[PDB]
Amino acid sequence: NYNTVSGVNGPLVILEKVKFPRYNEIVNLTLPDGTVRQGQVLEIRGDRAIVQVFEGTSGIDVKKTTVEFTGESLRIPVSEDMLGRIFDGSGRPIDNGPKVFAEDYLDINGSPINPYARIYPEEMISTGVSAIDTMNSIARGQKIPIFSASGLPHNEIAAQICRQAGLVRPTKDGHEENFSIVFAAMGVNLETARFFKQDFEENGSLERTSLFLNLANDPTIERIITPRLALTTAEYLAYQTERHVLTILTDMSSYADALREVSAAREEVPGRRGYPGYMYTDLSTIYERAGRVEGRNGSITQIPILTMPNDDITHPIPDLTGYITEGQIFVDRQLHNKGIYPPINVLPSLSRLMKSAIGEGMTRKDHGDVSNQLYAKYAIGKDAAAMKAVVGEEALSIEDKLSLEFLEKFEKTFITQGAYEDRTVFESLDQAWSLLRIYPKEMLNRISPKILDEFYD
Amino acid sequence: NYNTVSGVNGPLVILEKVKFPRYNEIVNLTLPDGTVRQGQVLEIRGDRAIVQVFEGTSGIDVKKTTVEFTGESLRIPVSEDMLGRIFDGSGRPIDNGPKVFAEDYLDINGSPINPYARIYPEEMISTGVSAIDTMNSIARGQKIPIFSASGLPHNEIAAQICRQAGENFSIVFAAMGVNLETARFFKQDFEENGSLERTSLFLNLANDPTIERIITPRLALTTAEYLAYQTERHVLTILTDMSSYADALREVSAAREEVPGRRGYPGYMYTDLSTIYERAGRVEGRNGSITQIPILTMPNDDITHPIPDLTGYITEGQIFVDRQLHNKGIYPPINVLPSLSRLMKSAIGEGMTRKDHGDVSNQLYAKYAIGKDAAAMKAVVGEEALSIEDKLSLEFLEKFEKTFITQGAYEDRTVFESLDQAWSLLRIYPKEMLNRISPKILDEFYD
């Protein structure tokens, strides 16, 4: 207990009388009203020490306040049985579940992967959406960003993705140990969080996965630190527990604004458009938590989600995740506002590990070629959509009309997946060959002869 | 009082070992040159004090200057004998007359209006211009912002507006760093009208200090407040060259080394701008109405500057002057796109002006918008005027620009004359071409 607080300015406070203090140290602040508010040390000096109370210094009298020093940094209670319990921004209970008995305690900061020990993506990962695991294939050890927008149900897409993530490797003929999913929420609305818990408990994936939810009403420190903790959670199931894991981050924009308030907590002059200049490194300690480890069977894959500011791709968030992450999954505001299914623009959709996630033995031999053929059909179909919007439908050419039907179909069918609906990769290849069958055999220059002879039937 | 000072940063002065200091107080200082001036205390901290000079700190010795502090805030001598006369930036008579007898003495800062005692004016005051009283309805008691550009004749238009306007309406003017030529032209117009005897103002010119003009506007504001709360008559307050006032306030905040915003403006300016708009409004039980109608110049002919942005966001509606229409050679250049009046609501309809008022206003906005898009189309595409709708839209836009937009400065037209002129001008477009006009409005004028 320390009443030695020197002064309180905003959420951060300074306290004299400190000996042998550390960085990012935890402290428990008992306020004058008897309230217990947790806090973390922002900085330390030889005279006093600066901490930050998550509950704020509001209503806390510097005279009558007491401070108990924990003497330790940010840590996590790692366990193999940790899966199935719900927690809050501070790692405390949320859904009123049980208290997990910890197998081992670890630091939340973690450590980066050694250069010679890194392993590339090999095994394919099924996304489950008709527009996701098919067009741009995804594999374990790949960084795939998901760009959503304002008014876009990125929550529902994340729920469908989590519902389809469990079945990602049913066709693998690793089966005994269920794939672990990690949900981290930062600055989410009440309706979205409630629907998240309701759908998570309803799908039954709430038991086989882990959820940490920090809402908008909650402090920024909870939402910002939620990510590193969940990262340690995915790290424990890979290097130690050795199991297949999948990471998903929701509302990275709120975590960016939270990181902005946290960076402003050091009272530093902000950079361009109110963002820290170290944000490159801030994301570099985040997206670097994904990959395959050499000698370890368990691999961790991450697919974050972020809202582009004011419907602009010039946004610092998009620009930061752009050169860093491998490929990007965007959202078309046109497809979402036309009353259709998942609005991922076929042009913008790409994945760098798509080379390792398809083919015979990985996904299918009908995957890549037909993907490129369908994408070309949608693109040329759009070009024909503009050309027919010019000279009319009487001027429609062979490839033009073929692309018109192919575009209308791909848009109203191929694009259409479902809300909770998850279709198998085989269903994707079959629906693809069948929908592309509308065109003749020579109408697709994107197809190989061997493929055309061994597939079309 | 202290004759001993610590240091001096620009116009701002700071003294040490001062007692019984008053923040925002009137202070009389006698300098080394024998010159005496007035100033206002910015702040007081501990045993030290910080006061500012309104007339400037130039030509003063730290030892030979003596600062007499009243210990109380600034109190202006409001009187009813100020009619037809003139005062300087410091309040001193510039009319070469003597000091008038003061009826009362109160703060120049004015007083906050009570929440339950306020009154929403529906009053309709004829502007006199066909493009003014119609487009943006002129109402006594309302607040209409005015943003102009450099080299723009805003003074001429404002003068023609005050002249063709006129129980008569008393006008009170407030000059902040006003130009010599501007003052000369305003004097020429006010004298040409003959209403100069019924008007009064505090003059702080460009040759004179503009930093003491910030209080001059406040003085004229207290004058309007005293005119509304006592004399019970229609009052109109005006702040001239408010851009210089914003630049000066920005200089005062910059000298304070405080947190600067856009264009050097202060951080608490959110309230400060309100003080410029707090010079308007009526009260419950008062027959008189006070309405502030300030005019400022947007920097580099850009309304995107903090000044025009705050002036537009705070006050309801703004009167815009286009540089193109002013360079065209036609009369007064009000842009129907940017210009608007929130007081054009209660002042329209039957019982106020006419039942064809609001409809013709909205139809005018639609015709101007369609004409503008038709102008963009006529520029991008050929001279074929983009089929039918755009042809009638562009023709009606140009016709309304050469007629309705320009009513003249020396001509005073009623609202009915403008309505009839618009009735003759809207005949080029079809009756079904107006989507803003209802069934009654279409059957309104068939004459």
Partner: peptide, 21 residues
Amino acid sequence: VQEKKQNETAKLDAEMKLKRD
């Protein structure tokens, strides 16, 4: 502005050290 706050804070620190001395 941030540099001004840092310098003012450094002056505060200097004042604290002076008080300590």
